Structure formats: C-alpha cells, structure tokens
Amino acid sequence: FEGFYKLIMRRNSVYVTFIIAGAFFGERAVDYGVHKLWERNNVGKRYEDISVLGQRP
Amino acid sequence: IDAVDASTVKRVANKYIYDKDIAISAIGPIQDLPDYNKFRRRTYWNRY
C-alpha cells in the first residue's frame, strides 16, 4: 500500500513504470470486456455455431 | 545542529520542498519572471 504509493509520487522512474503497467492491464481489460459484450450480442451467429460445420457433402 | 547530516537534510527537503506549493511576491519590472506553473514544476526533477 504505502510502500508503492510513496514510490509512485516520489520517483518518476516508478511513476513511468506505473503508467506502462496501467496501459498494459487497462487495455487488456477493455479488450476482454468489449469481446464479452460482442459475444453476448451475437449469440448463434458465430463461425463455430454453424450446425453443419464439418459436413460439406 | 550536529545531528543534521546529509540524510537529514534530504529527508527534511522532501517533506517541505519536493513537489510542494509555493507563495510568490514580486514587485517592479517582472514581466520576465516565470509564471506560478513554471515555478511549481521546478519543485521536482523528473529525471529521478
């Protein structure tokens, strides 16, 4: 808690790492959340939802 | 006074100076004097 907190506002090197980590985790969480809502809104329309998927003849 | 060593000065400076608000009082020809924001940025070093 206080250990990381005092390092972030005191050293710019730590703060820069905090920005990089936030960009990494923040973008991944948004990408995951957007995909979950995309899957929910498109039930049954996916490529793997095809009933005859695997029997061409 | 003898108890104030180099580490003591740095600790006190971090308590009172580092990234701290300042008060400015200027008079005369002071158009070239930097603004509050410039003085406020110069209270910390981003290279550390």
């Binding site: 050293r11 090197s13 730590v14 820069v16 790492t17 960009a23 990494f24 | 550390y48």
Partner: peptide
C-alpha cells in the same frame, strides 16, 4: 540517487520492452 535511479530507469525500460514486445510464450 545515482544507483537507485539507474535501477529504477532500467526497470522501466524492461517493463516498456515487455509492454511493446509481448514475449508471452518465449518465456520458456
């Protein structure tokens, strides 16, 4: 102030490399 800063900036550089290049799977 010199060794600690060098360690801190090296850590940020390593974090940036893992963030730009994602070597997930290369960690074997």
């Amino acid at each position: 102030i010199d060794i600690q800063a060098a360690a801190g900036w090296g850590i940020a550089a390593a974090a940036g490399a893992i963030w730009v290049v994602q070597p997930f799977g290369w960690i074997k």
